[PDB]
Structure formats: structure tokens, C-alpha cells
């Protein structure tokens, strides 16, 4: 029911980091029109067509006042997390 957040208006509030409990966590700041559903994905390097972000937060959103937290699992190897156009490389251990 929400539109997708404008993919040009994200920056990192807390960059991708290890959560302890075998997941990857991150926070984003969004400066555009709210509320909206956060477009999030990830790819294995050299495999741009296949999303590999397995979302633990399955419907991340920016609300009128809050939102921005994303948790995912990723496969081992060199990955890139995208939140809209915002990216961050994430190497995942086996």
C-alpha cells in the first residue's frame, strides 16, 4: 500500500555491520517524501541479476517519524548491499 521510497534520497546512518547473531544490520536516513517502502536488495559481485538479500525485516519502511532499520542475511563471498542507489560492499564469512 506504500509507494517505494525515492531511491536517490538515502544515506547511511549506521553502515552495514555484524549483528552478532549471524545477520547483517544497518540503518539509513531518508530525506524524501514519507511514508514509503524501502527498496533494498543485494548482489553477489559479478552476479548483478540475482538478488541475494534475505530480509529478516521483510517490509522495511520509512514512517512519518521513524524507520530506517534493515536486517538481512547474505551468502558467503563478496556482496554489495543496495538501499535505493546507496550501496555498501559486504564481504560475508562462511
Amino acid at each position, epitope marked *: 500500500t506504500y*509507494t*517505494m521510497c*525515492d*531511491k*536517490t*534520497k538515502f544515506t547511511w546512518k549506521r553502515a552495514p555491520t555484524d549483528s552478532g547473531h549471524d545477520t547483517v544490520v544497518m540503518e539509513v536516513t531518508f*530525506s*524524501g*517524501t*514519507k*511514508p*514509503c517502502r524501502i527498496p533494498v536488495r543485494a548482489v553477489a559481485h559479478g552476479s548483478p541479476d540475482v538478488n541475494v538479500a534475505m530480509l529478516i525485516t521483510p517490509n522495511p519502511t520509512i514512517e*512519518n517519524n521513524g524507520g530506517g532499520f534493515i536486517e538481512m542475511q547474505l551468502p558467503p563471498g563478496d556482496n554489495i548491499i543496495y538501499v*535505493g542507489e546507496l550501496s555498501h560492499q559486504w564481504f560475508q564469512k562462511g
Partner: antibody
Amino acid sequence: QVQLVESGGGVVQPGRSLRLSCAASGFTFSNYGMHWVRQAPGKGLDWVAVISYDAISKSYADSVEGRFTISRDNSKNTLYLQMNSLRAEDSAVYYCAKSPTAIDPPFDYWGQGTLVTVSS
Amino acid sequence: EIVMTQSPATLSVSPGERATLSCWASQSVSSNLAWYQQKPGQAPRLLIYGASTRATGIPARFSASGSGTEFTLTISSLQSEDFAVYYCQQYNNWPPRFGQGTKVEIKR
């Protein structure tokens, strides 16, 4: 360079239907959100609908929700507004408006507008 | 939804003088506030986005400021082409909402 040409305006009887289009040139249409704004004779500007660059996202003003459908053909660089169940108070100049980004306002470029007159 | 109010409805200023236009939001819209100019019989034109950033090809006598619920547009040294209707628009929250406009007319 950037041009937005609307067409499809005209007279339509109450309760019937109209499709507007807006042909874009001079920019990469498929990278940008597009909006419809309307302006009744002598009144202020009135936001109608938005569609994201990739057509996945649409939103409507409350006064037209459930009656209007916005869509776009990115291989034809064309934006559409399908207007059903038209009322006299839908009479307005309708503008297509480009977003500088993927979906959000503001509106950086505007068409010249097309006149919709809902009347018997 | 957010209600955008502009004040005053009409402003009469002489050429060369300064015009200050106000825009009020019923709740905070941060800095996601735009200003448009519309001359009689023409499409509107973007002037200001992000509350204070000038759009391209907008001259420097247009400036704007504000955040949250109060915004002003200032036109310094009104030139005859500056006389028109000005609309604010919040785009912090869907649906984006225009204010009702302020007519800037030439005082004589």
C-alpha cells in the same frame, strides 16, 4: 531540450471517461517520476497522481482515488491518465509534471496543459 | 494530510521594492518545501526546492528560507516579470500539497 506535450483534453459528459497522455522528449523519461497536476479555471494548483520511474509505485489524491488510473509506457516515452466517472468538478487544465528524481516532487518541468471540460 | 496556507492572498508592491511571501504548514514538513511561479496563462515554473535552494535559471533576487511549519519567499527588487502568482508545495508527506497561492501585483 526537455519537452512535455499533453493531449486528450476536450468535452466529456458527466459520468463518462477520458484518457489523457503526455509525450516526453529531451530527457531519459524512464529514469524519472511523473505526476499529473490539475488547475480549475481561476483556482489554485491541485495535485492528482504520481507514478514512479519504473511504474511500480503509484499514488493518487483522495478526490480522484478509485476513479483515475495513472500509467506510463517507457518504450514510448508516454505518460497516461485514465479518468473514469468524471464529475463537473473534475473540469480543469491538466498538466503533466516531471520529477527531478525517481518519484518525489518537486516538479522541475511542466507541460503546457490540456483542457478537460466536463459538461452536457 | 498536511494543510498548506499562504499569506497574504494578495501583495501589492512597487517595482524595485521587496516582496516577502509566507507559507505555513499544519505540521512539520522539514525542508521538503518547494515554491512555484505561475504567470497568467502559463504553466507553473519551479523556483525553489528544499526550502532554500534555487532551481536552475532562477535569478538571485529570489531567495527562500524556513523549515518545519513556517517558510518565506523573498523577492528583492521586484522586476516587472516577477509579478505573478506564487504557490508553495510541501513534499515531505504523501500526498504532496499545494498552498492556495499568493498573487503579487504591481502597486501604483
